[PDB]
Amino acid sequence: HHWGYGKHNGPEHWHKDFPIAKGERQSPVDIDTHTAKYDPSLKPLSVSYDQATSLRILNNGHAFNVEFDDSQDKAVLKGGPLDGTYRLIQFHFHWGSLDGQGSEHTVDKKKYAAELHLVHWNTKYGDFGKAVQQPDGLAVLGIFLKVGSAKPGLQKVVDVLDSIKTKGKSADFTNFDPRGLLPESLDYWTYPGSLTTPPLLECVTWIVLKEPISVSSEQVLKFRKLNFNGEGEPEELMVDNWRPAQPLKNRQIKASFK
Ligand SMILES: NS(=O)(=O)c1cc2ccccc2o1
Ligand SMILES: NS(=O)(=O)c1cc2ccccc2o1
Ligand SMILES: [Zn+2]
C-alpha cells in the first residue's frame, strides 16, 4: 500500500490499485438535505457504550485510531436502520489544513472542519475481516466537527497526540469514554456505502448524525501537528486526510427526523 493524501498518491489516484474506487456505492457523498426523505420506519439509534473498553491509540500513517476491545459485546450499535448488533472496533477522524474543509460527507455542499468515524462490525460475521466482505458487514457512525467552544471529552485524545506524532507509533489509551464525543441529538441520515480509505469495500451502512459537535481551534490545531511520515523522515503534516464526495448513483439517503 502506497496510497495516501499527497500530491501524487491522493484520492484521485486510488482507483489504479483499488478499482472499486469507481464503484456504485462509494463513500463519502454529499447529503442534499432537501432530497433526503424522512423515513418514519427508521428507529432511534441505540448507542450502547457504557461498557466500552478503549485499549490503545495508533498513528497508522493516514489518521489516528482509538482501538477498543471488540472480543465481546461491550460497546455496540443497534437499531436505526440496522438489523443485529455491531461492535465498536475503533474510531478515528478526518480533518483539514484549515477549518473550511476536512469532513468527508458534506451537507448541501458544506464542508465541516473534521469528521469522526465510529466503526462497528456486524457480529453475525464473527470477525472484522469477514464483515468487510459483506454488504451489511459494517456500520459507521459519522459525526461532524465544527470549530467553536472546546469539546471537553475530546481533550484526553488531543493531549496524547504529541506521543504518537509519527506513523507506526502507539500509546496505551485505556479508560476513554467515547460517549463524550457525541452531540446531544441522535437524529441522522443513512445510506449504503463504502469504506472511505482503501480497500474502499462496499460493506458499510452509513449513519451520519445531523448535529455537529463543537471543538475548539486549539483542539483541531493539535490534530494538524501529527505527521503522515515515520520517525525521522521528512515532515509531512497529517492534514487533509479526507476523501471527497463520490457520485451518489442509484442511492437514496433517508432521514430519521421530520
Ligand atoms: N493507486 S494508489 O494506491 O493510490 C498509488 C498511487 C501511487 C502513486 C505513486 C506510487 C505508488 C502509488 O500507489
Ligand atoms: N473511513 S471509514 O470508512 O470509517 C473506514 C474504516 C476502515 C477500516 C479499515 C480500512 C478502511 C476503513 O475505512
Ligand atoms: Zn473514516
The residue extents of the domains of the chain are: 1-258
Q: Which three cell numbers stand for residue 21?
A: 474506487
Alpha-carbon gap, residue 160 to 219, rounded angstroms: 12
Alpha-carbon gap, residue 92 to 87, rounded angstroms: 15
Q: Which atom of ligand 2 is nearest to the CA of 201?
A: 11
Q: Whose CA is nearest to atom 7 of ligand 2?
A: 195
Contacts of 11 (CB under 8 A, 6+ apart): 5, 21, 243, 244
Q: How far is the CA of 148 from the centre of ligand 3 (A)?
A: 22
Alpha-carbon gap, residue 90 to 94, rounded angstroms: 14
CB 248 within 8 A of CB 30: yes
Alpha-carbon gap, residue 48 to 51, rounded angstroms: 8
Other beta carbons within 10 angstroms of residue 93's beta carbon come to 26
Q: Whose CA is nearest to atom 7 of ligand 1?
A: 9
Which ligand approaches the C-alpha of residue 194 most closely? 2
DSSP state of 70: -
Q: Which three cell numbers stand for residue 7?
A: 500530491
Q: Which three cell numbers stand for residue 138?
A: 459494517
Other beta carbons within 10 angstroms of residue 100's beta carbon come to 11
Coil/strand/helix, residue 158: helix
Q: Please give the class, per CATH, of domain 1-258.
A: alpha beta
Alpha-carbon gap, residue 244 to 204, rounded angstroms: 17
| Residue 196 CB-density burial (10 A; 0-12 exposed, 13-18 middle, 19+ buried) | buried
Pocket test for ligand 1, best of 1, 3, 5 (most atoms within 8 A of CB): 3
Q: Which atom of ligand 2 is nearest to the CA of 138?
A: 6
Annotated binding site for Zn(2+): 92, 94, 117
Q: Which amino acid is at 106?
A: T
CB 234 within 8 A of CB 215: no
- Which residues on neighbouring strands pair with residue 58, listed in sequence order? 65, 170
Alpha-carbon gap, residue 40 to 183, rounded angstroms: 22
Task: Report the pocket of ligand 1 as residue ranges, CB < 6 Å.
Answer: 2-3, 8-9, 13-14, 16-17
Distances from the Cα of 96 to the Cα of 104, 128, 257, angstroms: 10, 28, 29
CB 108 within 8 A of CB 32: yes
CA nearest 206: which of 59, 18, 45, 2?
45
197 lines ligand 2 (CB under 6 A): yes
| Residue 180 CB-density burial (10 A; 0-12 exposed, 13-18 middle, 19+ buried) | middle
125: left (phi over 0), alpha (psi -120 to 50) or beta: alpha
Resolution in A: 1.2
Contacts of 146 (CB under 8 A, 6+ apart): 112, 113, 212, 213, 214, 215
Strands 204-209 and 188-193, bridge-based pairing: antiparallel
Experiment type: X-ray
DSSP state of 133: T
CB 256 within 8 A of CB 80: yes
Q: Which atom of ligand 2 is nearest to the CA of 140?
A: 4
Quickly tell me which residue has 475548539 as its cell: 216
140 lines ligand 2 (CB under 6 A): yes
Annotated binding site: 92, 94, 117, 196-197
Which ligand approaches the C-alpha of residue 90 most closely? 2
132: left (phi over 0), alpha (psi -120 to 50) or beta: alpha
Q: Whose CA is nearest to atom 9 of ligand 1?
A: 9
DSSP state of 29: -
Q: Which atom of ligand 1 is nearest to the CA of 13?
A: 4
Alpha-carbon gap, residue 240 to 5, rounded angstroms: 7
- Beta strands in the chain, from DSSP E residues, in sequence order: 30-31, 37-38, 45-48, 54-59, 64-68, 76-79, 86-95, 106-107, 114-122, 138-147, 170-172, 188-193, 204-209, 213-215, 254-255
Alpha-carbon gap, residue 164 to 62, rounded angstroms: 12
Active site residues per annotation: 62
**Cβ < 5 A residues, ion ligand 3:** 117
Alpha-carbon gap, residue 153 to 151, rounded angstroms: 6
Which ligand approaches the C-alpha of residue 93 most closely? 3
CA dihedral defined by 121, 73, 212, 254, rounded to 10 degrees? 50
